Symmetry: D2
Subunit: 512 residues, 4 copies
């Protein structure tokens, strides 16, 4: 009559559905990470504090817009708000900082320093009109556009609002017919579905933004418009040695990214289902197919996946989501998404706090509604037989956690790897990852179920006593957070020697 | 490389997900019914005609608003639009008419006799201080006003969420076992009006117990005994007593609008999947309703969440999906219908039929009913040969419904001479009803043949299959069987 | 419930299915696994053959690695005399198939003191001589053993092991002459006439089809046998050679390849693809390969035959102790039941009926065990796996067949009635392994006899004249099946059965499935 | 992938798992199924028992039907002399359990011509007089048979069937006297001394514990036996009486209930709850109930024992023909393999080792078959179903045990090493049926011997002194287990093993799993 445990015992998925119970309350622990895009509505320290309290785990900075000065101040405010809670190591929550690249974006020029259906529109590459745009002349930044489009090509403007069809293709210009009508502003996004755009994966702009991210000690990079594995390698190369620990999340936003997903996933640390641009590049009715394919393959490969964009779109103006938006968040969790994201809802909307609180509430309910019986069985069957002791330890810990309905899986980890390997098998119980590495604690939010706790206690002289100290630290946090209490059973993962790579010990212990 | 047939062969659901292919186009036939609420934006004959072309199968009239004259004119326009195609039974599409009752609604009064006060959080409400309600019959309980806009807690009330309060607004009592009658005097008038207007189904609002369903059915009387009663589950009590409600009903609507105010909004998806699962298990139609494409009221394209919501409702197992404001008052009713059509077809191909068909059979009883065995045998044959359609001759629809309960991939072309049977068939996933108007032939074998060839001609014209394809045909074995018990696997002539 | 292990049938796991098996849950009347009996001195008379048919014999096996053509002709006449003794009642008449077991590249001994039934008792440590002198081919005794492998001394050496009669007696070559061998008995035992000799690891060079086999195979065609059990099939080319000898008139004779050695197991897939069926010939197999590996080969071959939809026979030593005892051992009871649970279409008796003291009891015991084991099958998993492992088809009869089996499970039908001329339609139903018996109505006598090769097919031979109105001819044959099922106790009026028929006269057009209450 | 049927292990269906079984895929060295051998004249000497231990014997089963306690004490001493002959090498020492079979409500005949090993040949149709006159208790012959059930003339009539020696000989009462019966032997056979007598359908009211059993059981406690095989257990109260006779001094002796008649099968659930394990005693069972139903009772009982996590023994006539022949029949090879596939913890040999001509060959054959069948288990389905049928628990050892088995599958572990005092921790691992052997390290000699009751448990008895530092004591026992599988060929460097220990010295708190590469 708890955590949908009655539905958990069903021998079929259909009966599992039939047993879902609105009167079965979920656990306190929320496993799905919440990523919030920071903007004018959420930039202040005071609002950022409320965002952390409401459930924000990752702050997303969109380098689509804004100077390095602007984003540096945003990062300072995020850390000021985050460290405001540092006086309580028990209740302190690490907050990651993510850098979303601009990438190969196509943007229009400045209007004069209403498009109508059927009219003719010239697309100019001459910079003398880079700010002199009007209903008859439109300047764009893609200099080699005439080489990659034809008279049959479609051109979309302003997040798919305006549709254009090339009617005559020149060498330095394009003539199009308006398939919309509508109102065009300045520096709007342009989409070229099906076209083989030859813009660099890492532009000159992308190079300094990524180097700025390395300088500012960001935790992850959301790389826009990844089209092939070599694109990912370029991003990782730009990050270099100093950036080698930054997680690379490839954003799949167009047809080519979907077709080359397998090679992209193998080269990346994770994936974002960037449904905003994806829904303009492919038919909107096919987006759920691409979303479920990518989440499935990420679960199968054991790499984090983010579901993004328009999840609670109506809350930009309203304090409540629609029923479809509630369903979308829950189904993304049921699909298997490690993280869910808010864009305009937190960047510019009128109710950023309510949007964060809503994603937290829905995620907790959906996590309990997961059919773990089938999921764990299928994840194990699709994962290979290994000789890695940590991998065998991880699956034994998850199986043990199901057998005793443990309150938590406690994992000591330096790099996060040991905890990621547990999360890959999707236990119902939260994974309390104890680390002294602040970046590991922040990066842990990318992975479903990992509740990172940052130990700041000095290293104890006896290593066995230092390990014990950190295990007891996890117990105290879990009890204070209400994840479990004394007498409950938890599973504890440690290694046989100091350092990374040696997690091989599972203990089933009552909580002291 | 079509209809996600690669994903269909996966040995696990996880691998089935991994194999979903945006470049795998679906079949032409769309199996999920589309229910459109008719209103000012969709009331004209010409608009209703275009909605039929765009995919509308059921016209829903919401009797929470409007006079009998207004709805009678709406019904007349629907029948005028529907009957435009009656001169060609091959291309004629039956369109059902549904009556959504007002039900036990609680409504406030008029603001100081007029037709707004601004309530402030923490204030007392018991004008801005005086609130009258029409519900004539504890502390800490929650009372919500105007589609959940204002929240109040009984203190001995205190405003929990403030807002601008109008006149005669709906009131919701979450968790309360309200004792209002299931059928009000207004509901009796509307239901008898529905009987006179020959409606096909009733969407009964705020059904709270099995006895509520029986009370509705009694009002429909003798002529209405064949009208399908769909119980709308909209509050906590309906969810808790769902099982007795389902067995007493002909179908279920997940009325997520009111449900999301009566129970925490983050719990609605649990109730939806529970109800669709139990309806799938019982073989009774289930409707997913409300705010599925809400943004399309003002925009020609839906949000990413709205596309997911429609697709996941089909994957859940919903027989029908519904549009309310999107078609009743929105600016893009045709685009909303067309979008539900497109998404449903893509989602229908993405169903994991291997597990679904296996689990539906394991959860269905061993029976001695020859038609139940015939239906499951026909669905198995349809999967084995990838048939273009399952053709079913039926008078009441029962034989076709029994096929639909086992959820074949192929469309079910149900041939009937009963117009009400054809219209009501839209409640069941996959049933494409066609109304034969040819006279009954003296030789019974030729009457069956006449109707089978009618189905062949319909499928060819609709693009469901062509000559040479393989279909399954369910008929009877003799004149006056009374039961469908004959399955034939035949090439299309 | 409380019948045909229907409680165990509803279990969500195979383990719980095991836990629910109930010795007090009686099976149905219908027995689905065919019983093949080897005919010999103990079972040759018309009167005994009549009782063998009554006790459950479906196929009579004649082993042509022993006996003359005249001798076997009289046996065939006796089998058909006994079979046609029941012809005066077409409702209760049971077709009985005749099987021809080839000699193949077998090494066979001679006659003990001029008789095929005599035996001598070999004792441990004694000396035995193997001679190739054809003067001793019928003068075998405790001191002299003649065999037919002329090049035997070229492939054996001193200390080598030679086994006789399915590995029963082991002999060690002690001296190697040019045309003879003298041996020592390592384990004692009692040796009969024309027994098999096994040389494991020896490169035996005998042809797959000998000159004797050509004569025997043509004799089977002349005598209108229903199937050929081809001994020691080692490769697909062996099967093709046999099929060529069978010619055009034998094109309808089912070719069952016997897998008896290492090569047959390793090349099983190409052998199965070329054959009509398979016999797990465990007698020779259990000495040619390690005895502890035979169950692996058996379950592999039964599994692959089930997967391909071709009949598979489990054979030899199933009830071996009943050659001398009226009740079997516990291992023998388990062996028969597990062969059925493995998925074997037919089970076989060799010495138990050919020469044993209790041939009727052995047939009855296989009948009793088979019926109990068939109810104990976990049909829920089996039908599910057969369908997932079977391809999507364009054959209307294949889709009709799988739909009929699903319907049979859904309504727990008393039978699936199938009208068929060649048997194919009934075979396609049997491949999906319904619990209900498949009553195959045919006017083709060979189709009726050959149907015993397929699990669950109860053949009935209609002798009524072909009716002019084809709809009335179909009804005539369907009602004939109703009459048989009622008389046999498979169902009664009010029960539900499934009926498979065609849309037109001829073979190949089964496409109509009806779920009908029994009239 | 070409070893231990790992290709078949990966199949998505049981049908495909069967299809992939490969006679050319060799199993691992470790054999998981325990082998129980009944000791008798053929296996009583110290020298023979030493060869039996090397061939694979894990448990010596003693039936005290003849001889004084002094005679049986010498048998026990001889077993332990043979067992301790290998003690000079703790690496290769194998613990050997001793089992005691109660007489129970058994009816037993007398001595053939004064000897326990003499036999007479009964012939079909002859007359055999059954007498209760004690002057013939040791004077049995082909014409006079004495048995110990004094009330036999009260419970049979003229025409009744009387079976002797597990149904081998059948007799029909032709005349009844006050204290004698004149019977006719229906089938002939060889009649030995002190054979069991079965009276199917007779209302025998004999006690669960006879007076002979009271003396023998306390003698067994004095002789430090490890387990008791209680005959003809019919209800839970029967088990309680056995445990009461064992008393406090015997409280650690495991009681294995033998199910041998209808009531034991029908009341199985209450018997299992009161017992430490179950023996499927198919000898008496196959004559008390219809022989065609025995496989149902066997698979039901093994399934329910697997579900409960209690040992189950499959017994009797598994290799019956090997009493006289050096090679088993094909049915006997199948029976042993299918008992392992069913899920039996132990398989047993009775006459094959007690009196047969080839006791060593019988032991080696059970070892060979068991190893092959263990690789052929469909672990994917078995582990899934064992977990689904086991409840969610709060016991840390249960969660640790299932996590260790899952880890053993994930890395294809060479072994699961378990430190245990009472055996419970190792028993809890065995309940989830890992493919890898369970090396249970104990200092308790009785725990080591009793561990043979559980599938997969390879017991090793540490005799090294207890170390002051507990971490060194755990290390000593863990690496001792390494050295054994190391030397036995169970694994080599690069393989992965799973190690189960506790957090401190004590009993009941096994909660630590370590995944370590083999040094
Ligand atoms: Mg960006
Ligand atoms: Mg984008
Ligand atoms: Mg409502
Ligand atoms: Mg042979
Ligand atoms: Mg016994």
């Amino acid at each position: 009559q708890t955590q949908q445990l009655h539905a958990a015992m069903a021998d079929t998925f259909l009966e599992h559905m039939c047993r879902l119970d609105i009167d079965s309350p979920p656990i306190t622990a929320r496993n799905t990470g919440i990523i919030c895009t920071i903007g004018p509505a959420s930039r202040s320290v005071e609002t950022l504090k409320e965002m952390i309290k409401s459930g924000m785990n990752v702050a997303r900075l969109n380098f689509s817009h804004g100077t390095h000065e602007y984003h540096a101040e945003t990062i300072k405010n995020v850390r000021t708000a985050t460290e405001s809670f540092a006086s309580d190591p028990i209740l302190y929550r690490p907050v990651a900082v993510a850098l979303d690249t601009k990438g190969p974006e196509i943007r229009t020029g400045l209007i004069k320093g209403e498009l109508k259906k059927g009219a003719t529109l010239k697309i100019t590459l001459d910079n003398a009109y880079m700010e002199k745009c009007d209903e008859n002349i439109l300047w764009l930044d893609y200099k080699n556009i005439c080489k990659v489009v034809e008279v049959g090509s479609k051109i979309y403007v302003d997040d798919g609002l305006i549709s254009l069809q090339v009617k005559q293709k020149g060498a330095d210009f394009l003539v199009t017919e308006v398939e919309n009508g509508g109102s065009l502003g300045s520096k709007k996004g342009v989409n070229l579905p099906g076209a083989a755009v030859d813009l660099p994966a890492v532009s000159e702009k992308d190079i300094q933004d990524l180097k700025f991210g390395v300088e500012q000690d960001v935790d992850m990079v959301f790389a826009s418009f990844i089209r092939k594995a070599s694109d990912v390698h370029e991003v990782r190369k730009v990050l270099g040695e100093k950036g080698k620990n930054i997680k690379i999340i490839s954003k799949i936003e167009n047809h080519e990214g979907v077709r080359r997903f397998d090679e992209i996933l193998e080269a990346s640390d994770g994936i974002m289902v960037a449904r905003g641009d994806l829904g303009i590049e492919i038919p909107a009715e096919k987006v759920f197919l691409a979303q479920k394919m990518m989440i499935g393959r990420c679960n199968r490969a054991g790499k984090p996946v983010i579901c993004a964009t328009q999840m609670l779109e109506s809350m930009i103006k309203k304090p409540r989501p629609t029923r479809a938006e509630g369903s979308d968040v829950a189904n993304a969790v049921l699909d298997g998404a490690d993280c869910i994201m808010l864009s305009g809802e937190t960047a510019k909307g009128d109710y950023p706090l309510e949007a964060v609180r809503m994603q937290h509430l829905i995620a907790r309910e959906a996590e309990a509604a997961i059919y773990h019986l089938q999921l764990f069985e299928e994840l194990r069957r699709l994962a290979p037989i290994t000789s890695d002791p940590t991998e065998a330890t991880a699956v034994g810990a998850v199986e043990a956690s199901f057998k005793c309905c443990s309150g938590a899986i406690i994992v000591l980890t330096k790099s996060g790897r040991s905890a990621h390997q547990v999360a890959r098998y999707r236990p119902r119980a939260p994974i309390i990852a104890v680390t002294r590495n602040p970046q590991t604690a922040r990066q842990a939010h990318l992975y479903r179920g990992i509740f990172p706790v940052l130990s700041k206690d000095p290293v104890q002289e006896a290593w066995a006593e230092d390990v014990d100290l950190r295990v007891n630290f996890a117990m105290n946090v879990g009890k204070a957070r209400g994840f479990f209490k004394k007498g409950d059973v938890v599973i504890v993962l440690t290694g046989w020697r100091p350092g990374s790579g040696f997690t091989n010990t599972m203990r089933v212990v009552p909580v002291p």
